[PDB]
């Protein structure tokens, strides 16, 4: 779920929510799928 | 190695504010609304009491560790540096 | 606040008071009002009770509380949703979203027609005479103590039967005392900071503490290890 | 304002006042005017009764109340598109865009014929008798006390009655007072101050709220989660 | 503290006070209030008598001890996990997490509802008459003694019965032995300062020493070797 | 300490104050009282005697000797280990490490149940009357007399029976004969300074000196050759 | 070579705080609440002790060895190459 | 003594610091979208 995206707050923290707002919740920024599509982008090249 | 630390005095949180609840406003909006005409002011205003008690600024509880940090830090640079030197095995012959 | 707030009746500093032979005109009329214009300057709200209790609104208004002096918060008494404060203009008014509050007298102006809402309010403690209730601590004593006396040897000093100097000691004691008071009511307990401490450090920000009755806001922030 | 305005009459300041005995010929007659003066000169607008009330603008003029003092907004009733300031110099005169008004006395010139206009407007809370009714708060209350004082002292001294100590010594107290009264009525209050805060952190700002009436100037400004 | 609190009887201090012929009218009764009243003023903790005592939660409130001035902490009898001060508005309001407490008079209120919590609270050491037992410190004690003549000559200086300038020789002197006694409760000790050096040195940082009751605040962080 | 604390009788004292005819009612009585308010006020740890005792704990408890005043150390008897102080709120109360102490009057709250501690504190060289003895070292000797004077003259001048310059004289004099004792007291002989030596220059740092008795505080660290 | 020491007084913790509770609190928040308003400060406030004991900032018990350091190690690099070159063994001929 | 003096006052609001700031938010994050497609400024010229 986080290289699609989704972000579970109840895995970072403890949890004191379910509503898709920054202000309560927390924005992913998709900073591990460029690292792994160079690894399976470099299998389809071999 | 501890950061560094403000000595801090809340006479001048408003009325009727907790200072749990003053702090948790300025954390986010970065602005602290005060109180420079509280009761416990009334001596520095009207020349009762000590001018400093309503200035001077906030006092630092502060130690120049990361210059003592930087210290020992170059003092192992250049032991091993030394020592390296000492045998034949430099750097650039270990890379 | 470090020490707790046990109550002690009004003549308590009638008691100190009049020790000083200047002072023994005075009478518990006397304390009443200085008193209350005291505790009103200084303003501090542990000397205040919190109270808490529910109304009805009829049509963007509800009637308030008798001995109330100032709203901690409003919410909505199904959802739990608290009120912030009114920046409308023409709020009930229609023509040819959030909800909000507004207090101005024994009136509560809301945003909603037909709901139920609980205030958290803070009054005064009351003796079973009827009349206001005062703390014990030597510091607020005592600072009340110097407001009786200086506005005391203000008036006389108007008159001229006070020397200009007993006057300024006067209030400059009381200067002094107001800034200890101040200090001594208002810097955090070990508790308290432990509270502070918990908003203070928090490496994912918490700014929706309002919405819950400031409720989480010392809540210790923990981070899951990876 | 933290506190809240709980009404009292005027001899309320009478009872305080008199305790002097260099003031006991003031009366209510002088504790009307120098109210009046002492709430203008400090231009608290929790003081004043917020009200809305609609009129018919005739040609480029509406009749106004009785009672404004001072215009919130105004806004067509119809559209409710708040009005704005006239700069223009030739309103209502023809030779051979975005409305606006003006108010003068009991005349409103806006910039449309024949319409219907919503105004949200200011005034004093009167009592049962056609009298001006203050906040009990004691800062407000000790703060009218020292001005009377204050103003009552100046007679006197320009009289020759009063020593000028007495006089510098009640207006050092006054303004100390009249600047904790001031800050006491306008610093906000915690709700007002979530007001603020969703007015203050906007990613996307918000100018807009003076089409409405400030109604969203106080709401949270949500972000949507990608 | 370097030295030790040796308890003597009140009266100690009218030993010394009445060798001064202008203070010979000073009694037990005024020795009692001036006391406290210094206690107060100078809030040192190391006078306080440490009491740890059990209590039961009704719901959500709970019965105070009698001779409680301050709390140190708060925590449950079963788990022993410290209580943090209660920023909730709402705790025992329902409508339609981690635990805490908040103290105003002879009630707690908790966010627990049935439960026995320990409270480590302050107290004053008594004699065996139901009076206050002062440390016999000789800087504690010149500084009560300089405390209760600072008092009592102003007293007389707004009688007019003592020249301005002994008063200012008084505050003086009172004001400097303030600093020292201050000074002298507060620096620690060297078995406090291995508290605090242990503290303070800590290469993984120790922030969680609430929950326990401060018992590891002060052990040494050591460090295996590798 | 660069000198001897060679130790003589009070009335020395008394026979270098009456050699002023102003000081001529002074006793023997007077000089106690001053001697011991001097001596705590200074706090020299030179002018007190080392001891150590030995003392058994009950349960977390233990009785304390009767002339201590301050405590160097306390350590376990058996293992030699040294005690911190006690940041604990809850020490001996269950529920449903590293050792540590603490003191208030006639009584020490330690951490542990059953064992025999020892406590290197300080006390009061007496004398065969049993009386407080004070070292000969005359700038002690001169500043004690100061001090007896200064007090003595701001009595008289509170009376008025001295003029203010004489008390400015005197307050002046024992400020500086009071920097010039703790400085005498204080600044380490060659001994102690080779000791600080030794303490402070070390390539390897020593930071377990509480562990033993300060022990090798001052121990040369040396460094073998290679 | 120890480092700089802050010369610390504890005239304005607050009341009721004991010296290692109040130190553990601004070690976490890098905030010390600090009490202006004390017993022990009112001389410096109604002016009858020097009004210095509230301010000037604490003092710093500093000595420079850290170019007393510097000035032995730029020394020890000087003979090393003085040596070097007396006998004709320069840093790139044991390179 | 200041009605023939003081100098000539300025009404200065300092809005160059903050369109700047702006300015080097809009580098960074059309610079951070660039990593997270693997898609470089080199990429594009």
Redesign the interface.
């Known amino acids: 779920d986080l290289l699609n995206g989704r972000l579970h707050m109840s895995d970072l923290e403890l949890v004191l929510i379910k509503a898709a707002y920054i202000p309560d919740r927390l924005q992913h920024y998709p900073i591990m799928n460029s690292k792994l599509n160079v690894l399976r982008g470099e299998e389809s090249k071999r | 190695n501890w950061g560094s630390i403000l000595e801090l005095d809340l006479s001048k949180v408003p009325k009727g504010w907790d200072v749990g609840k003053w702090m948790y406003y300025a954390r986010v909006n970065h602005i602290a609304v005060i109180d420079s005409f509280k009761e416990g002011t009334i001596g520095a205003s009207t020349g009762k009491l000590a001018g400093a008690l309503n200035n001077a600024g906030k006092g630092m509880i502060e130690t120049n560790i990361g210059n003592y940090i930087q210290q020992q830090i170059n003092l192992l640079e250049f032991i091993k540096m030394e020592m390296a030197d000492v045998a034949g095995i430099s750097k650039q012959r270990e890379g | 606040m470090?020490?707790?707030?046990?109550?002690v009746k009004l003549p308590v500093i009638l008691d100190?008071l009049l020790?000083?032979?200047?002072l023994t005109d005075l009478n518990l009329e006397?304390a009443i009002?200085y008193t209350?214009?005291?505790?009103?300057?200084?303003?501090?709200?542990?000397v205040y009770?919190?109270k808490?209790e529910t109304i009805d609104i009829k049509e963007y208004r509800g009637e308030?509380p008798c001995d109330?002096?100032?709203?901690?918060?409003?919410?909505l008494?199904?959802?739990?949703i608290?009120?912030?404060?009114m920046?409308?203009?023409?709020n009930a008014?229609p023509?040819?979203?959030?909800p909000?509050?507004?207090?101005?007298?024994?009136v509560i102006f809301t945003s909603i027609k037909h709901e139920?809402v609980?205030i958290?309010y803070?009054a005064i403690?009351l003796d079973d005479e009827g009349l206001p209730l005062i703390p014990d601590?030597?510091?607020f004593?005592?600072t009340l103590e110097l407001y009786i006396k200086k506005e005391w040897?203000?008036?006389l000093?108007?008159?001229?039967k006070?020397?200009?100097?007993?006057?300024?000691?006067?209030?400059?004691?009381?200067?002094?005392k107001?800034?200890?008071?101040?200090?001594?009511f208002?810097?955090?307990?070990?508790?308290?900071?432990?509270?502070?401490?918990?908003?203070?450090?928090?490496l994912?920000?918490r700014?929706?503490?309002?919405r819950?009755?400031?409720?989480?806001?010392?809540?210790?922030?923990?981070?899951?290890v990876?």
Not at chain 3, 77 to 80: D, T, V, W
Not at chain 3, 82 to 85: K, P, T
Not at chain 3, 157 to 160: E, H, I, L, T, W
Not at chain 3, 212 to 224: A, M, P, T, V, W
């Open positions: 470090v020490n707790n707030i046990n109550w100190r020790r000083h032979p200047l006397t009002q209350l214009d005291f505790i009103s300057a200084m303003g501090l709200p542990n009770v919190d808490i308030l109330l002096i100032s709203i901690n918060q409003v919410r008494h199904k959802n739990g608290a009120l912030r404060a920046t409308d203009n023409f008014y023509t040819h979203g959030e909000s509050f507004k207090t101005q007298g024994r139920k609980d958290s803070k403690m601590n030597p510091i004593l005592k040897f203000t008036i000093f108007d008159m001229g006070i020397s200009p100097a007993v006057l300024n000691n006067t209030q400059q004691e009381y200067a002094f107001a800034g200890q008071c101040n200090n001594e208002v810097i955090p307990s070990v508790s308290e900071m432990e509270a502070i401490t918990n908003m203070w450090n928090q994912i920000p700014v929706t503490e309002f819950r009755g400031f409720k989480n806001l010392g809540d210790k922030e923990y981070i899951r990876h």
